[PDB]
């Protein structure tokens, strides 16, 4: 399915305090009013989605049916894939090239081949309640931002806070989710039958490089934001750096039609030289 993402997905980008000021930042954000893919957490188990640049993963659920993620360049043990697994007690983050099944196991706590782990980490868990997450991996570190909000995507505005900055430098290209279920059977391979689970749903969105005008309140928290390239009025706001623009005419930007084709033109022919007179000689 599809559904427009309202003014959501914005996050604190630099952990620097600012009070009663407007700030413009160029970073990887989720464009406002952009459509996001929608999936359900009932059964089939889940196909792989590429990790182009960053994922905004939202989920409204009440049974812990989604419990972790998996990142990496491949599910086989040929490369140092990544594992992130939550639980009722703690988080387990691992980087060990653990071979996965043809499909990720349905929680019977683990199903994978041998490991040669290089990084490991554990900490407190991430837990009608709308959980939001942004996953980013750019500078040799893999970073997570998150937020849990009261309550479909709501129209209310709310920013994500930086949760974890991991140092792992694996080249991530694909990602999947991990599910669980009460008194559910587990096998290396299954059909689209799945196993029963609670009613739940989760959305996925892709981040893109945008310039955002963020508004900080008197207490240093972001209360509003403007997508600088959504419509002409928003672009005018970004140029005046003010949420209220007065009557008048403003020169916001420039446009230039891009080239539609590329051509190369050399000198008609390509006159050769004696090769067919050095290789077909009668007598050498």
């Amino acid at each position: 399915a599809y559904t427009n993402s309202f003014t959501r997905g914005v996050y604190y980008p630099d952990k620097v305090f600012r009070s009663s000021v407007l700030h413009s930042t160029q970073d990887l954000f989720l464009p406002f009013f952009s459509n996001v893919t929608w999936f359900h957490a009932i059964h089939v188990d889940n196909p792989v989605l590429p990790f182009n640049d960053g994922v905004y993963f939202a989920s409204t659920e009440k049974s812990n049916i989604i419990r972790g993620w998996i990142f990496g360049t491949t599910l086989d043990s040929k490369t140092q894939s990544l594992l992130i697994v939550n639980n009722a007690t703690n988080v387990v983050i691992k980087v060990c090239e653990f071979q996965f099944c043809n499909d990720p196991f349905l929680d019977f706590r683990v199903y994978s081949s041998a490991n040669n782990c290089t990084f490991e980490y554990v900490s407190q868990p991430f837990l009608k309640n709308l959980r939001e997450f942004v996953f980013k991996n750019i500078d040799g570190y893999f970073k997570i931002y998150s937020k849990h909000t009261p309550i479909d995507l709501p129209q209310g505005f709310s920013a994500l806070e930086p949760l974890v900055d991991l140092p792992i430098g694996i080249n991530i290209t694909r990602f999947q989710t991990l599910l669980a279920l009460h008194r559910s059977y587990l096998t290396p391979g299954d059909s689209s039958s799945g196993w029963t689970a609670g009613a739940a749903a989760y959305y996925v969105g892709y981040l893109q490089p945008r310039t955002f005008l963020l508004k900080y309140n008197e207490n240093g928290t972001i209360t509003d934001a403007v997508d600088c390239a959504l419509d002409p009025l928003s672009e005018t706001k970004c140029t005046l750096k003010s949420f209220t623009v007065e009557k008048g005419i403003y020169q916001t930007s420039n446009f230039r039609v891009q080239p539609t084709e590329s051509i190369v033109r050399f000198p008609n022919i390509t006159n050769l030289c004696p090769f067919d007179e050095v290789f077909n000689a009668t007598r050498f």
């Binding site: 620097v16 000021v21 928290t221």
Partner: protein, 50 residues
């Protein structure tokens, strides 16, 4: 974070994930101690023309 100045007890509420404070025009105005987590204000020591 390297700098010079007089440190004074702060009155602004840093949110828990923040480490720096800034005024308008990127002037580093405050810092939280990495040991006691106290907010400190930074003011450049007195200078002027004669």
């Amino acid at each position: 974070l390297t700098g010079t100045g007089v440190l004074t007890e702060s009155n602004k509420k840093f949110l828990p994930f923040q480490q720096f404070g800034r005024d308008i025009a990127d002037t580093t105005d405050a810092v939280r101690d990495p040991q006691t987590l106290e907010i400190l204000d930074i003011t450049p020591c007195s200078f002027g023309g004669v």
